[PDB]
Amino acid sequence: SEAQSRIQDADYATEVSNMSKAQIIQQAGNSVLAKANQVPQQVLSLLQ
Amino acid sequence: SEAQSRIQDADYATEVSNMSKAQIIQQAGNSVLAKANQVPQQVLSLLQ
Structure with missing residues (x-):
């Protein structure tokens, strides 16, 4: 189970940064x- | 009878220490x- 975790796990810590980056890029793209x-x-x- | 008592007797003196140790380890495990x-x-x- 520990090994399976590494292969398939979201790791929200890095995912939230990507989410915020994508939101900012979307707003910037709409403005431009x-x-x-x-x-x-x-x-x-x-x-x- | 003395020989058999040597063979099959719990020797409560050492067993009480083991049981107390097991309780301590169990409580530590639950807390952790x-x-x-x-x-x-x-x-x-x-x-x-």
Whole structure:
């Protein structure tokens, strides 16, 4: 059982760090996606 | 009869020490079992 533990065990200690990293990267990606989205807006100013 | 008593007699004097020792070891084992049980509690502290 001790040997089986090592092979298949989540080790939440490292998993929580990955979770927080992924959440931060998701929020950053959404924000930078928004910033890229306002980029097309400036073209309308050139029309007039 | 003396020879048989030599062969088959518990010799309570040494048996009482063994039984007291066994009780002490059992209580120590139960306490250390509880201490081991309390170990995985910090996983919540990690999670939140």
